Every structure is written in structure tokens, then in C-alpha cells.
Subunit: 464 residues, 4 copies
């Protein structure tokens, strides 16, 4: 507590279910014997007690959904669909609310219909949500002289020492938040929110209230006429498949991911390990050591996985990822996520693509136009210029068009609020504007308008 | 923190939520100022702190689902569908696991297909799940001299004094458990688990291993031939309504229900309060005081609601509940849940049904054949004989056939586990057998086989 | 046959079915006592013998299809759909072949998808087919000094006296041809021919091989992207309703129409007379005498009907049609077909529309841009200039847009062959070109390219 | 003209049709040069004239329908669907009326639902309709001393010499009748007539009025509950495959079949000859000469075909038919139609089935229980006992159950009228009763009630 404005919620200590099979556990243990970068520093005994709680909770996802995503990703890898992946850089517990989740889900659906029209093929929707609670950091000490914030699964954003302690109760708190968010995403995607009808207003509102709305009006009108045409051919909402939005996050905290492993039914066709904390996960630029625990963990799980590829990447290391992560040559099992910087993508990506294409494997080539284009503003905000983001996707498209390969998708950090985090766009967000609503707990996100704008621009790239 | 086995949640960095419309505030305040029976006794300041946490979490359900349920219950009230409501008497945190939830979902789906076939009309599926964590009790002190267990939202089942203390942190643990369970229920109902074809093996397996399998073989074979006929006519899974299982519980703990209130938008007209802790809630036999807070709270929320009616119910009071809770005459808004005792239902129900029918309102008449047929066994277990349960439903049907009214559904306590809680059934569970697997935290449930057997027997009442 | 290169096919003289009800026959007899213009001159006893044959043949259409068309026409009349009506001016027995019917059905489907896209609402497809075998003539003696050709139901096109005799065996020959054609139309519309997929090639081929293809490329590409978008949203051929093409003709030869009357089941909701020689029929400019037999016949049948309205039309006579033909105020029961000439439509149509709108009845306003725009070429061909056809539809649209009424559809004479009958269009058909392929047995038709071109132009009118 | 009761058709203004691929011409010519049994005896020049008329009429069927039938028959051959083939022995021009056609369509639809339910797999519906106008005969001279009636495509049923003269104009009358009938069959199968719900009343009405209704009540009630179950699961009419009834007849008159040949396009690969007089045709017991024109003609066409096998069939000859007519091993291309006699089928069929099965080809085994069980009654009527018909199907099932092969279907002669043609059934039709309504132009058909009764009995054979 009453004195601290804090409530202490007992973690119920509940009986364990049967353990995972010994043979699978033996494999997992050999993989986890590998060194792991960027891990929280909490004591082993606390970590273990927390893992043990999560080993018996209801999963966030189920294997059959992961199998279905794999099938849709195989279609992307074969050039017959497009991948849209997007959401917060760092979800926080505090902003894990109905309006914020609804806003991000809306933004993703809005982008998807526009991309679908431009691509003339299905778009698979993967949210950075329901688990994106842990971040690697470049530096152990931040500008305030504090232990760095590592995301809500590890410590607190607040700039004080007690908040920055690594506390493994946050593993359980992460789980609760993830399942609560996922519960909402499921509810929303089979509500009126997912109806293609709603785009009429969403896009029109965007075209009406945007500077440069005149630039997007034609395509917005085309889409509208496309929708009215299908309605006119007798296609109603209940004639279409239910909207599917998948959950993803960076698999960083191995205590969480391993506690969330489950065995499948064998009603599909043989039991294997799935990470049921999400549908797909990726391995970040700072944790993709070829002989590290993160890559080895990804080898052992059945989920589709991605690896972020920065400007230090070589064609040979990229091929090694393909060999470790797609040993069975299953199209769409592996996504290689390009984040090079707009000035570097046209130079650095083609040798990588060429070498990987020659393996005979079919990966998804995904563009992350954001993580390679960050800088600090003169006013001291971590920011990104919209134009550089756009230009990297542009470059990404040119690389693939020149090679005859499939530009497979984008991976963007976005939010459905009117934040001021990225510079530029039609609103022309300036360095001084950043201060009004810089709400991210980590990287700057495209706001609701900027991310919509990006989708129209990417639709136009898809049209060539 | 982990060292104290607690999750720490800040409240100070929480605000601030838009105020209710003035009239909804006024009405909600007046509802909660009324006397309230069977409430937990925790300090008001701690309760307020917990409610403040719950006021901004993602809801368990959303308004559009509740509106859809209401449309489907209206069909039931009109005599064009049947209501199946079932699940645990008391959900425990301990058993809130994938296997237990899957078992209960499955048992409900299995009963529903049988009942659908027997009824020749759609069956609405409502689980007692994702929130059924609070129990009213007949006595303050149990047989051990301890303060009564009142469900995991209030205190612990363990038979020691400290565990039995009312603990408001259980409001938050209840929500985390509910949303995790709901998340899984949503996942399961759009997996292959909900496919009608899975019935062939489920029923076959029940018929082969039941000691009374020969009695149910004919109906099971008929259902199977009906399913194969559907499929032979060109009906696949993709041609059917995705399975819907709604969440319900007794709206008992007003601290929880009020914190889970949310205001709807402008897609019906007037903004309304929805209780988003569940789709539908009911008011128990011990908290249905006509001028008490529970009935008054029910008048303020938009959800479909039910009221349990025990053997001291009068036709006049039944009418008063109808007029207070269905004041706008909306079929399906109100369910009257009869739980009389098998020896009493034939005499007590008809005059109640006649008076209510004469008002011109259309309630759902739902039979709860469990809560009026409970006795203590020699061995000291709270138990129910299967035959009395079946007999109450039988008498309920006879009452309706005689009046020409709609027997609208059943409300049962069941589990997908092979427990030994209710006597009788084909397994002929004896007083001695009860000691083997008496797992319930409160009332005895029908086990897998008993639930299924009851569905078959009720299917025959529907065909008769 | 052997000497004449003619085969004589015996007309089988078969037992009669029960007659139509006496009360309906009494009404019909009073209606048919009215004078009828433009009738064949064959003897009464031959006419009667031929009518008696047709009174017991399988119908060409069935009542339930006519009821369905009525419902779709009601949607047109309320401004929520668009009517496309088109086909030969005069079907001949000789050209009643698989390729010619397929060609006309294709042209109608091609036009329909383009109009659907432009209108952003359903298009009802009504072919001039399976019965368009009788023509009124302006003159009894033609330029060759012969009795005028009156269509194959009456006499022969060939320029010799024996062929021009009115021969009521042609009534039976008409029936055989109608049912054979209708059989094919039904087969074609549930074949691959009706699939929206086929437009990709049809429109592209048209854009590629047309002069002025550059003018239509943008809209053709939009439509293509619209189709690919709906395919990308998971809409496959079997997700759409089967294509429906209705049959229509001018109800001219009352011996035919009356012999083709049938009584409905009364399983719909009361038996009445339907003309089962077609789904809808119209009354021509030369036979629409307010007190004549044609209008009175149309009063007695349940089919939707149309009346052609020429430049002599007054607002008051138009209202009289509405009163006789839509006495029960059933939207879409009556279509008023404007054929004024492009120089006259903007002047003559608005007073007619105003007066009819003020009756409270909801007629379909349909534009016939062809019959008011005919002239004789210097080379002696009956022809039409494409530009004048287009301009009349344009004017028709302006009249309705100025009044806030619904431009409801078009009625055009078209064929799926590369004929040279109408001047102009993108092919710039000249007066000397007419001689190459002037194949019509009466009015000049838009060829396959010209009619497609007209659809693109009308789509652009619909877009404003 | 009308004065001569003839329709006059010119042949000189007819040409000219594109020539067949050289090999198809060569093969067709060689097929027709072979000896042909049971042909009409008209002059070659008159036949040629009639064929020239038929060569340019709209076909009765189209290739894509025939390809679809073939896919559905392949399912039957694989043991995954059941074939119901039925209709008149001899369609007459006299009875080619809306009521008679509707009655036959209905009887087939009624039998099909019963059989579907009994089989638990789709039932393919093939009518003997729209072309079943030619009969082979055992003798040239009938019992009156007249030239035998050979069906309306050849001569007249009237018992006078002039009517019995072979008249090639009946080729054209046959086509006009066929396409009129097909047109109606298409209309009916997409009207409310084909709705499954109409079964409840049809079966109810049969069960109430049948003297043996109590015997069939249980199955009828079961089917009804299956239908209501479908509907309770959310399956409406719009969710189902539109009804398909295919047309078939004995390919007897080669003048007719060759004139109705049409060449397909490039949508399978190689252009092929389709007989577009029907979907599927069969070769009769009297024209199945292995080196005769009928078998050879069947080898040239793309349609699925059948061959009747009577009691003198050997396993070796059965194999030779299979290898000649299914040379590419395409399941469903060939149907072997067993018509042995009820006293013979159990002994004669098994060795035939074994030899054919050993070839590795997949034929459809179809039971014709009519044509081997015909006798002359005391009163002078060609008749069949119901019990012998049922018994042949029974024996046919026993043969297949013993071998583990698929009883693929039945081929029956039925009508939707209450005729008195076959003895027995629940009505217990006696020799004396036959005189009341003996309406068939050739073999005795099962009446409405007998057909339905047979469907119920065969449904029980399918369930056994
Ligand atoms: O739905 C239910 O589970 C009961 C409420 C629980 C009563 C527990 C009494 O236990 P005990 O204290 O008697 O042992 O419904 P009801 O309100 O009675 O209709
Ligand atoms: O399908 C059928 O109708 C028969 C062929 C007609 C035989 C008529 C004999 O009449 P009759 O001359 O003996 O009186 O099939 P089938 O070839 O025999 O299997
Ligand atoms: O998906 C992502 O958000 C990562 C970057 C997270 C690290 C944020 C801390 O940055 P810093 O402020 O500590 O430098 O992308 P990637 O770099 O692995 O591709
Ligand atoms: O639908 C139509 O084809 C009629 C015109 C048919 C008369 C053709 C003879 O013309 P002519 O060469 O004998 O003058 O349209 P409408 O004029 O009744 O509107
Ligand atoms: Cl168990
Ligand atoms: Cl009858
Ligand atoms: Mn980031
Ligand atoms: Mn209970
Ligand atoms: Mn004309
Ligand atoms: Mn026969």
C-alpha cells in the first residue's frame, strides 16, 4: 504494498505435467550447452523455478496453427504469396491494452489489404506481438549510467536501479501478458474488425486527412472499386476465410523459449518439439552466432524461423544458416531477413541471394528496411528517416527483380497510434516534433499514417 | 520478485481511463451500493488496487461475440435451437492446463453433436470455463473447522487456515488464468479438434468401452450415418460454421465483475456496459436476492444472463426476475435455470412456466439437473446419483411437452477426465469407488463417460 | 424432297394435356379480342392446329426462373443493380448454331464483367435469344417487290415468293430452335465459359488487337487487378453463384406467345399465367397500342415486361403504360425502354421520367441506343453510326444524373462475330466496308469489338 | 408447310463444316464400315439428308459436362461413389411432356437421396432420357404380323403397317424431342425441385400411402433426421452442389450418333470426338458384336460408355471388351452392365468379375436387374416380377461382397407415374391389374412406388 503503489501477485506453485521425451530432451540439452549471447543475468535457481511454472501453462499457440503457417510460408517462398510482418519494437506490459493491441492489429490489416491488391497474391500476416518482450542491447551501461533496459521480460523501462535488476518473475509476467494479448488478437481477427468492408473508411479517412493524400487517392480508389466489384459478384464476408494474424517475436531469452516447448499430437504424423510461445520466431543480428545456442535452439524446433542479416553478412555464412536451419529442404521453413541500410542493400544483398539460391533451397527473402537505417537526432532521440526506410525496400525490390528471385516480404516496426518517432513521411515529422509523442520503449516505429503510406508505396513497387 | 515467488505490478504508472456516461455511472454505483451476499472479506483498499490492475488488461471476451451469442440464444428461446452449458463446478488454477481444458472442450463438443442429432436443431455451446473461480457456500466454517473454501478467486483449497484467508491478489491470478484458458479454447475451436468427423471415433470408442455400449450403439451408428450422409452430399469442413464455444461463469465476486466492465462503441446505437470477463454469466441460488447487488448488477450489463431457480421459487417471483432482467422483451436475454430435485421438478416447475409464459416474454428454460440432487455418501463424499440426474431432465421434458413449451437446454457439471465423483452410470460407480479419483474442488462432476451417456439419454428425450 | 434439297419433317399430332383454368382462359380471351397489329396472315385453322401442338410441349423456361429474374429486376429498379440486354436483332434458324450462340453468350458475359466493374453493382444478363424470331415491318412490300420478311417464325429471308409466304409450321420450327438454343445457353452458363477467369484473356486480346486499345488498357488492367485481388482473398470459381443468362424476345406473334402460356405450381403462392417461351418479353414500338392485344396480353402474364418508347412518346401515355402494366406497384415488373435518337434523348426523355417517377411506381429505365439511330448508307445498307449509339447512352445518363433517377440498363443489338454492320468504332468501319460481312437478317448489330468497346465506354459513364 | 403437317428445312444453304483431323476421319470411317446389327432400313440418300441437318444443330450436351461425368464415374469405379441410372425403356414423342419428364426427374432424385444415405457416399444420377428413342428387337415381325416397333427414332408405335415403316425424318424429330427434354431437365435440376428438403414430404407421402409403409418407416425417419441434422449444422441449399442429372441412352442408331459427333478444342490436349447427343451411352446386348460397328464406334468417342452383359457372357470376352474400350486404363471410362437373371447372377457373375479385376483396369460394375427377368403373362403382357428384380440386385451384392469388389450401381427402368407394368411390390400388382395402366412402348417399368421401394431395399443392401 500500500506504501509503494505496487501489488505483489503470488505465483502459484503447481504440479508438473509429464516431462518431454528423454530423447528430445537429450538433443535440446546438447543444443543449450552452446554459449548464448545477450542473456539475462538472474541466478540459475530462480530461472529454473520460473521455467518450471511455465512448463505446465496453456500454450500461447498450438501446433496445427504452426503447421498451417508453414504451408502459407511455403507459398511465399515459391513466389506465390507475400509476407507482411510488423508491430512494436518492444511490447511493454503497461501498453499491453485493448486499444493498443486493436490499433496494431488494425494497422496490420490495413497494410495487408493494400499490399494484397498491389501484389495480386495473398499476404500472410505476422504480428510482432504476444511475446516481443526482450531486447538485446549494444551497451551494458546506458547514458544515465544504469544497467540497460532489456525489455519487460527481463527488467523495467523506468530509469532507476531497482527497476533495472534482472528479475525472472518477469518470465511469468511475460507469459500472462502474451496469452492475454493473443486471446485478444484471436477475438479481434474473427470480429467485424477483420472484414474487408472496413477498409472503405480506413483508407478514405487516411486519404482525406493526409498531406500527400492526393498522391494515394488513385490507388485507394482502385482498391475501393476492387472491393465493390467482388461484392457485386456475390462475395459476402461469410464467403471468405477468417482473417489470420500470426504471432512472432525474437527468440532471445532461452529460459522463456525452452519453458514454452511442447510435443505435438503425432496425429499429424510424428511428434516433434514446437515452441508454443509463438507461431514463428527469429534470431537477431546479435545472437546469430553459427555455433551459439540461439541457432542451435532454432534447429531443434519445428516452427518456421527467421535470421536477421546485417551488413557484415557474407554469402558463405548465409549458406551455413540455410544448411543448419533448412536441412530437410522445406520451402519457407527459413526466412532470411535483410537489414542492410538503404545505401548498402543494392551492393551487399545480390551476392548473398545468388549464393543461397544456388544451394537449391527455397528461403523467403524478407526486407527489414528499419534496423539498418537508425540514427540519433540532434535533439537526442533514436530515430529513422522515412525516406531511407522506403529507399531500402526499393533497393531490395531492385536486387530481386535483377536476379529473377522473389522479393518475399517486409518486416517493419509500426504502431497504430499517432506517435512521433520516425522523421518524415507525409506529415513531415521534424527533429523538434519527435519530442511530442516519442512513446517507444526501444526503436522508433512508423506511426499509423507512416506505415499506411509505406504500404501504398510498396504496393506501387509490387505493381512493376 | 522471483525470490518472494511474486509478480510485482506498479499501479502509479497506470492512468487514465475515460469516464462512463453519467447515467451508466449512476446506475452502476446504485447497483453496487445494494446488499451483496457471499462476498469475499478482504480490505477495500487492497481490492481497489487489484481492480485498478484489471481495469486496463485485454478483456477475456469482446462485445461483438456477446451480441452474436445473444442472437443465437434468441433462437433457443424461440424453440429453434438447444442450449448446452457445461464444465467444472470449480475451475482451479492447479488444473488450468492444456490436457484438462482440451478434455473439457472435447466432452462438450462430443455431447453437442449427439444433442444436435437428437434435437434436429443447432446446439449452442457454453462452457463453464475461463472464470468459474468463485463459489458461494452454505456455511462459513467447513467440517474441519476451517473457513470454507470459496474457489481460487477467493482462497486456497488446501486444508489449512493460512491458505483459507481471503486474498485479493487472487482477483488478478483469476484473470491471468481465465485469459490463458480462453486463449486456448479459441485455438482449439478453430483446430481439427472441432471437426465433426472426429466424432466417429470418439463415439465409437465410447460405445466399445462402455459397459452399456450395446444400449447406445444404434444411436451412435445413426449419427455416424448422418455425418457420412452430410459428407456424401458434398459438405466438407470448409463449408461449415467454425465451432463456437462461449465462456460463462457465476457472476459472484462483484470486485471482479465490475473491474472487467467495458463500455461498447456506437455500433448498436447507445453505448452499453458489457461484462468482458465472459460471454454470459448467471446469478446463483444464494445471491439472487431480488433487491440485492447481483440482480441489480445484471440489470446494468448487456450480456445474456441466467438465474438459478431452486425449489422454493414461486411463479410470482419468477415473473419479477423476468420483468427486471428482460425489461425490453428481448428473446434470449434471460435464461431461467431450473434446479428442483428429480422428485420435485414435475410438481414445482409447471406453475412457474405457465406464469412466465403468460407475460409474453421469451425466456430460455434450462434444466440444471445437478444442483438439486446432491447428497452426502456414507464414505463422506459430496455426491450425486446418475439416475436422479437423468430423472430430473426427464421430468423437465415432461413438464414442457405437457405445456407445449420449449425445453431449451441443460446446464451440467462435467469433466473430460475419468473421475469418480457421481455414483452410478454404466460404470456403476459405487460409494467405495468414489475414493479412487475424487478430484473436484467443490461439487461432483459427471466424468467423460457419464457426460456422454447423459447426452445420449437426453438425445432420446429430444426424439421422443 | 430429294429434288428440292429440302426435308419435310412431320409434325407429330399428340394428345393434349388438361386445358388452362376456365377463369384464366376467360380473361385471356377478353384480352385477345383486342385488335393486334403486325400479325401474320396465315389462316385461322392452321394457326389453331399449330398452337395446339405447342400447348403441350416442354416449356423453354420455368416459373421459378421467372420469379428469380423478377427479384433481380426489382434490385435494378431500386438502383442497386444494372440491366444488360443484348443479342441478335433477328435470330435465324440457319445461324442458330453452337458457334453463333456461344459467340453471343461470350460477348454478353464479356460486356457484363466490364459493366459490373464500372457500375460497382450486379449486372443482370438478358439475352435476345431463344425466340427472337419475329419482326414487325414498316412496309408490306420490300424494295424487291416482295412481301416483307417478318422473321423466321413467320416466313423466310430468301428473296422469293414461296419463301415469303406466312407459314404457321414455322411456329413449331421456332419452338424447336428456341428450346435447342436455350438448352445450349444453360449448358454454356454452367461451363468454364462463364468463369470470370476467362476475362483475363478476352479483354487482353481485345486490348492487344484493337486500334484504340491504348484508350481501354487502363480500365482493362484495373479489372484484371480487381479479379486477381479477389482470387488473392481466397475467392475461387466454386465460391461464386452460377452465371445466369436469361432469355428474352419481342412478344409479337400472339399465336406463339399464347400457345406457350402455362400455369404455375401454386407451391410459390397462387397459380397465375406465365409465358414460358422466355423469361422476359417486351412490346415493340409498332405494337404498343394502349388498347391493343399486345399490351393486354402483357397485363395477363406474370413475366417481367418491357415497352419500347420512341420519340413520339408523351409523358401521359407513359403513365398509362405504368398503370396498365404495373397495377400492383411491383418494382422491376415494368421496364420502359428509351429509344429516342441521340439528338433527341436529352430533350424528350426528362419530361417522361419526371411524370412516371411522380406516380410512385418503380420502373426500370433502360436505354436502347440503337433503334432510334438507324439510316441507309449511300451503298444501300441499313446501318448505324457507333458514335451516335454511344452519344445516346451518354445523353440517357445525363438525363438521369440531372434528375437523381437510376439509369437502369442498356438494350443493344450485338453479335460475337466480326461483322461489318455498324459504321465506326475503333475499327473505323466505313460505308464501303459494310459489304464484306453484312450478315444480319434485319437491323445492323454491333460486332464483337464494337460491343466490347461500347461496354468500356458505358463503364466510364457509370464511374461518374 | 402447315397444310401438310410438316416442317420444311432447306439443306442447300447449310455448309460448310471444318474437316476432322485426318486420323479421326480414318478411324470413324473404319468404325462405320463394320457390320452393324439392328439398324433401320431407310434409304441412304434420305439418311444423309437428315444427318446433314443434325450436323449443325446445337448439341444436346457439351464436352465439359462429359469430362465432369467421367471424373465422377472414376470415383464410382474406385469404390467411392454409387451410380444410379434410370428412366423409360422407350421414351416416346407422345409422352415427352413437362409432367412426364418432371415425374421421371423426381423419381430419380427421390431414389438418389435414399441410396446416398444407404451408401454413405455420393450417388451419380444418369437418366435414360433426352434420346432413348431407338430399340433393338428380338424379331423383325411382331405378334400382329407387323414390322416390329423399334422406337420413335425409327417408326411409330401405332399397330398399322404405314406407321411401322422406317422413316428417316424421325432422326430430326428425335433430336428436337431430345433437346427440348434436356432443356427442361436442366431447368428442373436448378429449380427448387432438386432441393434435398423436398425429400421429407416425398418419402413421408410414400410411407403413408404404401401398403408396406411400416416396413420402410424406420429408414425414412432416419433419412429425415439426417437431413435435419445437416441443416442444424448450418448447411443450407446455397452451400450444396447444384443437382446434376446426366443424359444417357443406348447408342443404337448409328445415323443419329454419327451426326451428333462434335470435335472438342485444345483444353485436354488432343482434339477428340465427343458424341454430344448424350453424356454417356451404352451398347446393348444385341449390338455388342466385338468386331461390329457399335463397339468400334464406342472406341472412337470420348464419352464414358457401358456394355450390357447377358447370361452368355464369358470372362474372356468381358476382358476383351475392357481392353478394347478402356485401352488407356481410365477408371470410369467403362461400365459393365450385368443383366443375368436373378436365378443366374450368383453363378455367372463371379468368374467374370475375377478375370476383369485381374487385368488391373477399374470398370464400374453396374447391375441391370430388369432385362434378364422378363416374362410373358397369361393376359399377354410383357412383364417382370418385382421379387425377381430385387433378388437379382441382392445376388449382385453378394457376388461383390464375396470378392471384395465394388457393387458400383444399378440400371433400372422406371417412371414417375402410377403404371401397372411390373407385377408385385407392396401394391401386389396382379396379372389382372396389368390391364389398367400398361403404358410402356416397350419393356415394363417400375412405377413411382415400386422404384422407391426398390431404392429402400437397395439402401438396406448397401448398409448390410
Ligand atoms: O452453479 C453452481 O456450482 C452452484 C453454486 C455452487 C454451490 C456450492 C455449494 O456447496 P456446499 O457449501 O453446499 O458444499 O449453483 P446454485 O447457485 O446452487 O444453483
Ligand atoms: O436397355 C434396354 O432397354 C434393352 C434393349 C431393349 C430390348 C428390347 C427387347 O424387346 P423384345 O423384342 O424382346 O419384345 O437392353 P439390353 O440390350 O437387352 O440389355
Ligand atoms: O528486431 C529488433 O528490434 C532488433 C534490434 C533490437 C535491439 C535494440 C537495442 O538497440 P541498441 O539501442 O541497444 O543499440 O533488430 P536486429 O538489429 O537484430 O536486426
Ligand atoms: O427490337 C427491335 O428490333 C425493334 C425493331 C424491329 C423492326 C425491324 C423492321 O424495321 P424496318 O426495316 O421494317 O423499318 O425495335 P423497336 O423499333 O420496336 O423499338
Ligand atoms: Cl483420464
Ligand atoms: Cl399418376
Ligand atoms: Mn527494433
Ligand atoms: Mn456446482
Ligand atoms: Mn432491331
Ligand atoms: Mn428395356
Amino acid at each position: 504494498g500500500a506504501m509503494n503503489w505496487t501489488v505483489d501477485i503470488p505465483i502459484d506453485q503447481l504440479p508438473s505435467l509429464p516431462p518431454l521425451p528423454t530423447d528430445l530432451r537429450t538433443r535440446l540439452d546438447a543444443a543449450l550447452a552452446k554459449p548464448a549471447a545477450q542473456q539475462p543475468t538472474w541466478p540459475a535457481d530462480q530461472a529454473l523455478a520460473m521455467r518450471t511454472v511455465l512448463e505446465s501453462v496453456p500454450p500461447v499457440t498450438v501446433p496445427s496453427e504452426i503447421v498451417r503457417l508453414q504451408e502459407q510460408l511455403a507459398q511465399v517462398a515459391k513466389g506465390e504469396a507475400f509476407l507482411l510482418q510488423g508491430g512494436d519494437c518492444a511490447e511493454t506490459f503497461m501498453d499491453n491494452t485493448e486499444p493498443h493491441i486493436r490499433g496494431n492489429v488494425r494497422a496490420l490489416l490495413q497494410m495487408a489489404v493494400v499490399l494484397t491488391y498491389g501484389a495480386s497474391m495473398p499476404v500472410v500476416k505476422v504480428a510482432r506481438i504476444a511475446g516481443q518482450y526482450a531486447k538485446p542491447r549494444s551497451a551494458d551501461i546506458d547514458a544515465l549510467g544504469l544497467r540497460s533496459y532489456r525489455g519487460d521480460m527481463i527488467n523495467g523501462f523506468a530509469p532507476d536501479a531497482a527497476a533495472r535488476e534482472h528479475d525472472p518473475s518477469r518470465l511469468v509476467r511475460a507469459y500472462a501478458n502474451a496469452s492475454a494479448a493473443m486471446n485478444l488478437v484471436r477475438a479481434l481477427t474473427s470480429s467485424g474488425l477483420a472484414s474487408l468492408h472496413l477498409v472503405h473508411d480506413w483508407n478514405r479517412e487516411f486519404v482525406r486527412t493526409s498531406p500527400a493524400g492526393a498522391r494515394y487517392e488513385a490507388l485507394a480508389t482502385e482498391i475501393d472499386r476492387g472491393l465493390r466489384f467482388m461484392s457485386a459478384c456475390g462475395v459476402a464476408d461469410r464467403n471468405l476465410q477468417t482473417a489470420e494474424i500470426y504471432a512472432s517475436h525474437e527468440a532471445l531469452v532461452l529460459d522463456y523459449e525452452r519453458a514454452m516447448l511442447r510435443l505435438s499430437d503425432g496425429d499429424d504424423g510424428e511428434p516433434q518439439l514446437f515452441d508454443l510461445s509463438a507461431h514463428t520466431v527469429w534470431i537477431g543480428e546479435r545472437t546469430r552466432q553459427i555455433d551459439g545456442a540461439h541457432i542451435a535452439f532454432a534447429q531443434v524446433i519445428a516452427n518456421p524461423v527467421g535470421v536477421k542479416l546485417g551488413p557484415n553478412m557474407t554469402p558463405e555464412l548465409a549458406v551455413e544458416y540455410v544448411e543448419r536451419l533448412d536441412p530437410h529442404n522445406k520451402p519457407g521453413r527459413l526466412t532470411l531477413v535483410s537489414r542492410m541500410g538503404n545505401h548498402k542493400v543494392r551492393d551487399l544483398l545480390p551476392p548473398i541471394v545468388e549464393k543461397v539460391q544456388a544451394t537449391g533451397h527455397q528461403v523467403i527473402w524478407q526486407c527489414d528496411p528499419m534496423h539498418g537505417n537508425t540514427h540519433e537526432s540532434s535533439t537526442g532521440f533514436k530515430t529513422r528517416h522515412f525516406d531511407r526506410i522506403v529507399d531500402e525496400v526499393q533497393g531490395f525490390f531492385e536486387v530481386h527483380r535483377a536476379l529473377g528471385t522473389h522479393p518475399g516480404g517486409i518486416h517493419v516496426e509500426i504502431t497504430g497510434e499517432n506517435v512521433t518517432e520516425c522523421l518524415g513521411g507525409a506529415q513531415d515529422i521534424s527533429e523538434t516534433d519527435l519530442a511530442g509523442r516519442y512513446e517507444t520503449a526501444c526503436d522508433p516505429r512508423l506511426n499509423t499514417q507512416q506505415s499506411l503510406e509505406l504500404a501504398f508505396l510498396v504496393a506501387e513497387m509490387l505493381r512493376d
